[PDB]
Symmetry: D2
Subunit: 121 residues, 4 copies
Amino acid sequence: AEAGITGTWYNQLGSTFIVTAGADGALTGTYESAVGNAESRYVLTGRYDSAPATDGSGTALGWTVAWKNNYRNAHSATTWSGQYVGGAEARINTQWLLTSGTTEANAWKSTLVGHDTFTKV
Amino acid sequence: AEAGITGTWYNQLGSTFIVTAGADGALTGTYESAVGNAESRYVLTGRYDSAPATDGSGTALGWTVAWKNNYRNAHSATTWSGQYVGGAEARINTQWLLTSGTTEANAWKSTLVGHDTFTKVKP
Amino acid sequence: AEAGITGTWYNQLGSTFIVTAGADGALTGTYESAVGNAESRYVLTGRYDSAPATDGSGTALGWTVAWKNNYRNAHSATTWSGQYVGGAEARINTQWLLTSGTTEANAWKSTLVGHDTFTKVKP
Amino acid sequence: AEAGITGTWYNQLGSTFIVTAGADGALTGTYESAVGNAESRYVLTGRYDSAPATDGSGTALGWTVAWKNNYRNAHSATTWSGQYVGGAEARINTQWLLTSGTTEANAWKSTLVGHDTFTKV
Ligand SMILES: N=C1N[C@H]2[C@H](CS[C@H]2CCCCC(=O)O)N1
Ligand SMILES: N=C1N[C@H]2[C@H](CS[C@H]2CCCCC(=O)O)N1
Ligand SMILES: N=C1N[C@H]2[C@H](CS[C@H]2CCCCC(=O)O)N1
Ligand SMILES: N=C1N[C@H]2[C@H](CS[C@H]2CCCCC(=O)O)N1
């Protein structure tokens, strides 16, 4: 559970994200996706509950990745919102929103939604 | 543009968002919500496209607030995903996901989704 | 109330929604979209709570439109999930999911999410 | 692929839904959930693409369930939007929205979002 968010995680797509969880709620690290107009690592920043409940619940967290790095700019940003659950097999279950910058004309179709499950395997 | 996003913003619920856009695509600031099991200010961190398009396209950005501060802890976190659209009346149109920590069993009802529009007041 | 939902509604994009609420909680009608790879009217079917609450709570409902008719086929379907709120100015506030058929590989980008507000004009 | 949507499907939660796909795009059947303020079968109605593309893509579909039957009324409705994919192991991958009727005061928290995968196993 605590600390354990820190590590390298992988999702079903093969994306990899390396995060560091700070004692007070911050999440910092890099994200490398396996799909989209992405190329290399991208910086990610987020927050998590540094004092989750002492009952059998997960730890709420979220993070953002703007898809711009020294190699590509896909003019989009993704936010993942979910919870971490530890145990012999820890995982982070998330739902995400990917918004692309559009002209007002196409704002209605600017956001994709999906889900990703991350494990340390 | 960092400058354009930087400022004080408010949404239809009456919540306050104070943000500074850094040159590196970083967003930091505080959020004051008008609703929920939230009391006072909460730290927020996000990222935005610091090199958007010359198209009248919006600038994509997103940020997260974990609802825990020194006074309260709602054991939940919200992420806002949207676009900043400048002009005389600058707006940040978003869609958000609010996830609460739950037991495996009620995880199916852990996430709420909605949308918020922010209007700029100050830098 | 079936009666209250029954009518012609329009949303901010300029799309038309003609619906009849049946006594059994059924919704049937047609949708005319102002946007997308959609041309003409499409059949819609949904359900609503025919026994809502005496609370000023909204009436929950939802409906689906597969974007295929005798003139076009966009190979996608949208479901709107929301609440009907009556009064002098009746509204149906919704959030929708638009899924396109894709190959396993691009399934990660198969669904769009948004929100639409409908205003009633006629019964 | 075609016809094959018709059948009894189960999701990870144990919910069961029996659907009939009509030649022209309609989906009709019953839903029995394993979670929430649900009890028995609930009627469901939806639509699907009766002429999906002839390429390796899934068939888009969606359906709604108002959670009211002769036993319970949870004053909510769920819509599932996703696509069907056939093969030796067919499945329906969906994302859903569950909206509860609220007073304006609580409209901001009226909708839950999740995902369900259905198989005939
Ligand atoms: N690991 C994941 N990669 C895709 C989903 C959500 S974010 C997305 C990659 C998008 C890359 C940039 C783009 O194509 O816009 N999960
Ligand atoms: N300004 C906003 N406040 C509500 C929406 C999205 S997040 C939410 C407030 C939740 C407060 C903490 C909680 O109740 O968990 N917008
Ligand atoms: N009235 C609305 N039209 C758009 C939104 C949600 S569904 C969408 C139209 C899509 C048309 C068919 C398509 O492009 O796939 N509201
Ligand atoms: N099979 C599923 N059951 C839950 C999710 C989406 S709908 C939901 C059951 C809700 C029952 C009524 C309620 O609790 O409001 N998937």
